[PDB]
Design an enzyme around this catalytic site. Structure first.
Site, PDB file in Angstrom:
ATOM      1  N   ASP A 153       0.820  -1.202   0.000  1.00  0.00           N
ATOM      2  CA  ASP A 153       0.000   0.000   0.000  1.00  0.00           C
ATOM      3  C   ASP A 153       0.858   1.257   0.000  1.00  0.00           C
ATOM      4  O   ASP A 153       1.548   1.536   0.989  1.00  0.00           O
ATOM      5  CB  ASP A 153      -0.835  -0.042   1.274  1.00  0.00           C
ATOM      6  CG  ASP A 153      -1.979   0.928   1.270  1.00  0.00           C
ATOM      7  OD1 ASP A 153      -1.946   1.942   0.528  1.00  0.00           O
ATOM      8  OD2 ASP A 153      -2.932   0.667   2.038  1.00  0.00           O
ATOM      9  N   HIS A 180       0.457   0.222  -4.820  1.00  0.00           N
ATOM     10  CA  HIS A 180      -0.711   0.968  -5.276  1.00  0.00           C
ATOM     11  C   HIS A 180      -0.801   2.372  -4.715  1.00  0.00           C
ATOM     12  O   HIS A 180      -0.326   2.651  -3.613  1.00  0.00           O
ATOM     13  CB  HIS A 180      -2.036   0.220  -5.088  1.00  0.00           C
ATOM     14  CG  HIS A 180      -2.379  -0.126  -3.670  1.00  0.00           C
ATOM     15  ND1 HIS A 180      -2.917   0.791  -2.786  1.00  0.00           N
ATOM     16  CD2 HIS A 180      -2.355  -1.308  -3.004  1.00  0.00           C
ATOM     17  CE1 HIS A 180      -3.169   0.200  -1.634  1.00  0.00           C
ATOM     18  NE2 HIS A 180      -2.844  -1.080  -1.741  1.00  0.00           N
ATOM     19  N   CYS A 191      -9.166   5.384   4.614  1.00  0.00           N
ATOM     20  CA  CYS A 191      -9.538   4.075   4.100  1.00  0.00           C
ATOM     21  C   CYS A 191     -10.668   4.279   3.083  1.00  0.00           C
ATOM     22  O   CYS A 191     -11.533   5.137   3.272  1.00  0.00           O
ATOM     23  CB  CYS A 191     -10.013   3.208   5.265  1.00  0.00           C
ATOM     24  SG  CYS A 191     -10.818   1.629   4.853  1.00  0.00           S
ATOM     25  N   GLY A 192     -10.651   3.515   1.995  1.00  0.00           N
ATOM     26  CA  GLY A 192     -11.634   3.698   0.938  1.00  0.00           C
ATOM     27  C   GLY A 192     -13.064   3.582   1.415  1.00  0.00           C
ATOM     28  O   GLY A 192     -13.987   4.120   0.777  1.00  0.00           O
ATOM     29  N   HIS A 193     -13.253   2.905   2.548  1.00  0.00           N
ATOM     30  CA  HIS A 193     -14.593   2.681   3.069  1.00  0.00           C
ATOM     31  C   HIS A 193     -14.885   3.504   4.323  1.00  0.00           C
ATOM     32  O   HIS A 193     -15.804   3.202   5.066  1.00  0.00           O
ATOM     33  CB  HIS A 193     -14.827   1.176   3.281  1.00  0.00           C
ATOM     34  CG  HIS A 193     -14.593   0.372   2.039  1.00  0.00           C
ATOM     35  ND1 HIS A 193     -13.530  -0.497   1.899  1.00  0.00           N
ATOM     36  CD2 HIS A 193     -15.252   0.359   0.854  1.00  0.00           C
ATOM     37  CE1 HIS A 193     -13.561  -1.031   0.687  1.00  0.00           C
ATOM     38  NE2 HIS A 193     -14.594  -0.527   0.035  1.00  0.00           N
ATOM     39  N   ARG A 228      -5.363   3.488  -8.026  1.00  0.00           N
ATOM     40  CA  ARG A 228      -6.638   3.299  -7.366  1.00  0.00           C
ATOM     41  C   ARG A 228      -7.388   4.626  -7.370  1.00  0.00           C
ATOM     42  O   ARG A 228      -6.785   5.692  -7.177  1.00  0.00           O
ATOM     43  CB  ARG A 228      -6.428   2.789  -5.936  1.00  0.00           C
ATOM     44  CG  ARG A 228      -7.476   3.274  -4.969  1.00  0.00           C
ATOM     45  CD  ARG A 228      -7.287   2.705  -3.581  1.00  0.00           C
ATOM     46  NE  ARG A 228      -8.113   3.412  -2.599  1.00  0.00           N
ATOM     47  CZ  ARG A 228      -8.033   3.220  -1.288  1.00  0.00           C
ATOM     48  NH1 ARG A 228      -7.166   2.333  -0.803  1.00  0.00           N
ATOM     49  NH2 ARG A 228      -8.813   3.908  -0.463  1.00  0.00           N
ATOM     50  N   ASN A 313     -10.872  -5.144  -4.445  1.00  0.00           N
ATOM     51  CA  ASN A 313     -10.707  -5.243  -3.003  1.00  0.00           C
ATOM     52  C   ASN A 313     -11.887  -5.956  -2.379  1.00  0.00           C
ATOM     53  O   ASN A 313     -12.948  -5.362  -2.199  1.00  0.00           O
ATOM     54  CB  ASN A 313     -10.570  -3.821  -2.434  1.00  0.00           C
ATOM     55  CG  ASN A 313     -10.600  -3.765  -0.911  1.00  0.00           C
ATOM     56  OD1 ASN A 313     -10.529  -4.787  -0.224  1.00  0.00           O
ATOM     57  ND2 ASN A 313     -10.690  -2.540  -0.375  1.00  0.00           N
ATOM     58  N   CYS A 314     -11.716  -7.233  -2.043  1.00  0.00           N
ATOM     59  CA  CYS A 314     -12.768  -7.938  -1.322  1.00  0.00           C
ATOM     60  C   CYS A 314     -12.674  -7.558   0.147  1.00  0.00           C
ATOM     61  O   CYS A 314     -12.124  -8.299   0.972  1.00  0.00           O
ATOM     62  CB  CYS A 314     -12.682  -9.454  -1.525  1.00  0.00           C
ATOM     63  SG  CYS A 314     -12.547  -9.920  -3.271  1.00  0.00           S
ATOM     64  N   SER A 315     -13.242  -6.396   0.466  1.00  0.00           N
ATOM     65  CA  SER A 315     -12.975  -5.733   1.733  1.00  0.00           C
ATOM     66  C   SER A 315     -13.792  -6.266   2.887  1.00  0.00           C
ATOM     67  O   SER A 315     -15.002  -6.438   2.762  1.00  0.00           O
ATOM     68  CB  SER A 315     -13.236  -4.236   1.579  1.00  0.00           C
ATOM     69  OG  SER A 315     -13.096  -3.562   2.812  1.00  0.00           O
ATOM     70  N   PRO A 316     -13.133  -6.509   4.035  1.00  0.00           N
ATOM     71  CA  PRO A 316     -13.847  -6.830   5.273  1.00  0.00           C
ATOM     72  C   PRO A 316     -14.637  -5.645   5.795  1.00  0.00           C
ATOM     73  O   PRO A 316     -15.347  -5.810   6.790  1.00  0.00           O
ATOM     74  CB  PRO A 316     -12.719  -7.169   6.249  1.00  0.00           C
ATOM     75  CG  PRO A 316     -11.599  -7.607   5.379  1.00  0.00           C
ATOM     76  CD  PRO A 316     -11.677  -6.721   4.180  1.00  0.00           C
ATOM     77  N   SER A 317     -14.525  -4.486   5.144  1.00  0.00           N
ATOM     78  CA  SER A 317     -15.360  -3.333   5.486  1.00  0.00           C
ATOM     79  C   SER A 317     -16.792  -3.497   4.981  1.00  0.00           C
ATOM     80  O   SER A 317     -17.644  -2.656   5.259  1.00  0.00           O
ATOM     81  CB  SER A 317     -14.788  -2.026   4.925  1.00  0.00           C
ATOM     82  OG  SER A 317     -13.583  -1.672   5.585  1.00  0.00           O
TER      83      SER A 317
END
Ligand SMILES: [Mg+2]
Ligand SMILES: [Mg+2]
Ligand SMILES: [Mg+2]
Ligand SMILES: [Mg+2]
Ligand SMILES: [Mg+2]
EC number: 4.1.3.1
Lengths: 427, 427, 427, 427
Positions: A153, A180, A191-193, A228, A313-317
């Site tokens: 990252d 990235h 964070c993206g989320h 990204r 991104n298979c995000s846990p968010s």
């Protein structure tokens, strides 16, 4: 003087950009001469970065897709490789939460010192190197390549083009395979989320991507560069200077001076096209795990750029079962790969596995003490048929390897470790 | 000139030594004046070291027994406290294996840089402090004391008395509550359950315990000092100079100059007795989890020092079910407690929980991709009834606490994190 | 549960903000209650940060002025104090140049990791503490205060308000006395005498100053907060949002989206007035040493804030002989002090002294070998009359202090260092 | 799947040991297959370590002798090379005093963290690389080789053979060219010119030298291995086990168990001979800078080992004019060079240069303020004739180099640093 590490000539470098298929769809707005001018008299070889980047590139082309889990410790990466995973994901979020150079726990807002991720890259590589050394003396051929490539990252680069440059250089020195870079304002990075995201102008992210490539070229390695975009959810942008961003600008401003902007897939798609010539892989963050939305993004970018690879991104968010049934969940990554999403990763896998596994053990231990630990040890024993080796923790961290070093220095050393150990006698 | 941090007087220190019940059974072979001369003109307050040492000492007298699990990251310690544990154990083995300042994976042989354990001590306190801050703004009263006492591994001190002194000083500055010190040769240090161990003479270890106490006194904190002996299995000692060691010397010497010596519970008992006046707790490493040998050791020490608390390593280096039945495993810690083993710990709890949980996830992930992760996420959701909170990783790591700083600085901030996050909208 | 480090009530803090003269001229936009909300259950004491800040404040009011030299190593600071100086300056430029955590040589552009300055602050305090320990052992009352206050470069805070907050907190944990914060864009931060500087909006710098104060309040210490403006030479600003900035905005933009702004003393004066309620000292970067320009600035600020103290950078980035004459050079600081510049410093003193002395030594060495070194040694012997002690280098780095620890632990040690030394016999 | 970094075969290594004159009189007691067994599947290239070691080996033969000064910062090494010096010496004493990772000031007793010297090696290489990069961009060809070889202090290896191994490996990763190792007990280590020294048995040091060579072989770089004996003044030894040591044993012991031994040139020559097959250079610590003693030591060694090169410490621990006259002092290094001392170095040059130059400045500054500084700036100005360049500090530190990066990334960048600088305008 010496010829060791003598830089290549500009013509040699140009030849390589023109010749190697690695560089087929890759635009550089600087010259080969510019690269050489920045190299001094000596170019350090970066074996692990070179090896990793080349392995990663082949995998993206040779496999149906490459999936990874976020690793925040060296041992975490070792287990991922032992379990058959072929690449490692290094998450800035995880580094902020539990593995950064300030020693503090942080949310994902670029609060930690900028050399934190390079340190974890170097840590992960050291840990894989040890696993590789131990396997060799053990005759373990179960894993063909312990040095799985690492994609790390780069966040928003911790400032400007020069900060981006120094981070990529540091990541390379540590042996990264891919990095990235996101189009957020570094001083307000999220964070993206998370909410409260602020975009920077399209051209500013092209400078970032150009900067990441320059550092890799000067370091003479084919680092995989991933772009990204956070435009799916970001409602703010620093400026309206870029004509490509103006279509989403609403005129309204915040007290800090930020411009409000209309978010969604549309500016994501336009951004992806603009980054394509400067990105080996392209990634748009999204609010939900949704296959149609991914297809939509994939189609539009491939229309313009047929061979542009994508990342997801298979995000846990995401609360996964809130949005998807077991059936869609089961086929998710496969479907994604069919669309061109060749790199897929669960960013916070390590955070969750670590926090949950320690909570579960500590809770049982609180109630039942040794019974609780024995359940874990017995699961470990059981796991050996799957390939798990860490039950024998001494050899796992290299007690046998340092015994060999010791007996190489002196075969009759009285002070070797494994002989007479409980591990020898009980496991 | 200032009176901030002005050193106490010898008289004040002496009064403390004469009247504080903490120091009842503690021998110091140096003077209160000696301590003062080492303090220059300012003594830094070490709040966490002081608070931790005081809380630890009371728990040892208040609770039936204090138990703990090895933590190698800050998040691990957080989950241990969240799950109800009242102390943290900081394992040198784990630092060697996955958390040291060289960045390398090492066996447990004092190979890593000597400030490694102190850095992890500071990290763990930082992490506990974050969880504390978060609890306060969330109104979460479920955890009574977030700053659980940390007991850390001082190994063999990384050299002589001065290296010992510096390590204890660094642990204290980082906020340690207690530290343990073993009677091995530092240059040949081994995990207690490895072979190849070399003892130092009884008096040299008394010197170590004296140095560790002295560093605590100079830093002005009542740090809990733990003495560990490795005589149950060590068959080598550096010298026959000490008359208390001579009865076990065989006569034979190795090429290195080390003396063969008769290992077992007998030299452990003698050493534990010589160490007692210099140790708040005493610990003997042993080759199996055995209540009888524990009883034997406890009885013999207490017969000569009735108020002497002991410590027991419930080691993952044992194959528990190979040696005991589930009934005996279930009662092990309470049985030990009754014998005077007030501090009990699973040294490598972190290494195993981390390694096993990531192998299991990565293995599942490799076969089922997202199905494997979702099972974990679902297990996490299920854990909430027990008190687990990390499913909401954003607040767990302080996104809300930093939002609070952000709105304290600027109530009108457009860039706070949790508002509009997927966490807020999906959890 | 414990009483150590329990936080104060909001009422108590308010009482102090109301009644302590220290806060006479200090505006805080947040509340006492906001401060408590962020302190968790326990507040770590920071002895050296508290002592230094209190000592620094007093000196600012007692001495005609307080001057300092930039120190980049601990020995440097020790020598500055030895030579009779009363404060230490910690330059960010010097940290970029030769003392940051990336290990690289950088220009002054916020390129290095953000915890680099805190680490040097901690280093300098450690070094002074050793000098102080050694004095108390050698019965040396020569220096009255070895723990001189440290004033450290906070640059542009390495990002947003939260990055600022974290820098100040780390500065405090390391024992800083005061810190300075400048109104530049961090992603494009520059040494004040470099070109290409980009200002931030006035309110954004008030946000920074507020964040710096808040971190000090939460850490419960009266850190001196210094506000620096770069408006004399900067021709760019990130935004026109702030009405106080608009009079200098020309309306011209750059391709990055920056706004052209009219530079000079006029915007510096306006910004200083805006920063005044949030700053213990104000500092305007200038392009030349000029007692006239200084008086202009000084008078304009004091007209609105009569008791506002100022700071002045006697910068080596000036060619001192191109602009001034020997007589004025001699009176310079004294005259500034009468205008209210109570803290004055030479930023790059350490860089130049270190680089020059080594070049001079190495040059001679190359042509003359041992003769060149012997000369330095002679000057050192000479300088002993003025108080210098470093010629006896063993005792200077604590050999005698550590011998004392060694004999404290065991009076009969045969392994002490100074007894039998060539320092003992040849000096 | 990659062949990048595949290790050489045993046969290839064997061939190099047989035929390459580099390995002429180098005994290795382990085999080529032993080296390969430790190399895993990947061998990282160590460009700077290889280059430096090769260059250094040549200079030691092509040149009359190689001399060096102790450097402790990166700028310090740059000025050494700029002044014509051909090699850099990295003093452990200096790391202890002012540049180690604990942040503390220490006497030279192996108190600091074991990775401290490797970090300074990396820093020094970074600093020289920056200077190389700037000079190439400025067309400065006045220095032929910026990357001078670095010879570093391995002290007593910080423990046993495995600690030695790891220190050597870390030194090589950092880019060291040579490293020295002394025959003291690490737990009681002293600078050569302190007392209270303890020798370890002769064979134990051979172990150390063998381990250091093994690490270099595994790392596949021709690192220069230096052995130092401290037998001239040491009156103690850990054991009488080695028959080569027994002639000097007196029979008296200490309470710590050490053996009294007869010090002097005698055991130094015996130990030198024992170490010779395992050392590229040999070094003997002396009480005084006496040419006669050096002749006596040298001759005795060359009679058995004709090609054996030697190293000499021209130490600031000697009061130079208290023993030698200005005529001898001037011829000292040339004379030594004749006797076979091809590597000569002033261990504490940086310490004294730094501490003196800053005391001088700070002392003037306390009396005269700006007058004192300009005196220094004037000398630096006066030195641009000799090649001094740090007067222009912005360029010295890379401002122009990063401007070039900035313009390469974006030629239209309106925030470059040198244009508009005071450096561009006053210098
Ligand atoms: Mg991230
Ligand atoms: Mg592309
Ligand atoms: Mg341990
Ligand atoms: Mg600065
Ligand atoms: Mg040394």
């Amino acid at each position: 003087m010496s010829v060791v590490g003598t830089p290549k000539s500009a013509e040699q470098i140009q030849q390589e950009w023109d010749t190697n298929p690695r560089w087929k769809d890759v635009t550089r707005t600087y010259s080969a001469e510019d690269v050489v001018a920045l190299q001094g008299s000596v170019v350090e070889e970066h074996t692990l970065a070179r090896r990793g980047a080349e392995v990663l590139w082949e995998q993206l082309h040779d496999l149906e897709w490459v999936n990874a889990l976020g690793a925040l410790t060296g041992n975490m990466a070792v287990q991922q490789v032992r379990a058959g995973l072929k690449a490692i994901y290094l998450s800035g979020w995880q580094v902020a939460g539990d593995a950064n150079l300030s020693g503090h726990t942080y949310p994902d807002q670029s609060l930690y010192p900028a050399n934190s991720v390079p340190q974890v890259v170097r840590r992960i590589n050291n840990a894989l190197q040890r696993a590789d050394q131990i396997a060799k003396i053990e005759g373990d051929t179960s894993v063909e390549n312990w040095l799985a490539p690492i994609v790390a990252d780069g966040e928003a680069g911790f400032g400007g083009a020069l900060n981006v440059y120094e981070l990529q250089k540091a990541l390379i020195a540590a042996g990264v395979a891919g990095s990235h870079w996101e189009d957020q304002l570094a001083s307000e990075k999220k964070c993206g989320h998370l909410g409260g995201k602020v975009l920077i102008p399209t051209q500013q992210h092209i400078r970032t991507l150009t900067s990441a490539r320059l550092a890799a070229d000067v370091a003479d390695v084919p680092t995989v560069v991933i772009a990204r975009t956070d435009a799916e959810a970001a409602t703010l942008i620093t400026s309206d200077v870029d004509e490509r961003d103006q279509p989403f600008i609403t005129g309204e401003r915040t007290r800090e001076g930020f411009y409000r902007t209309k978010n969604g897939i549309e500016p994501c798609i336009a951004r992806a096209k603009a980054y394509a010539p400067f990105a080996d892989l392209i990634w748009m963050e999204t609010g939900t795990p949704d296959l149609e939305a991914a297809r939509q993004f994939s189609e539009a970018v491939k229309a313009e750029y047929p061979d542009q690879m994508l990342a997801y991104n298979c995000s846990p968010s995401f609360n996964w079962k809130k949005h998807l049934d077991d059936a869609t969940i089961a086929k998710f990554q496969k479907e994604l790969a069919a669309m061109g999403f060749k790199f897929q990763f669960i960013t916070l896998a390590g955070f969750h596995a670590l926090n949950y596994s320690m909570f579960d053990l500590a809770y049982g231990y609180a109630q039942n003490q040794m019974s609780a630990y024995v359940e874990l040890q017995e699961r470990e024993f059981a796991a050996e048929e799957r390939g798990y080796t860490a039950t024998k923790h001494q050899r796992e961290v290299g007690a046998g390897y340092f015994d060999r070093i010791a007996t190489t220095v002196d075969p009759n050393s009285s002070t070797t470790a494994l002989t007479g150990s409980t591990e020898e006698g009980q496991f």
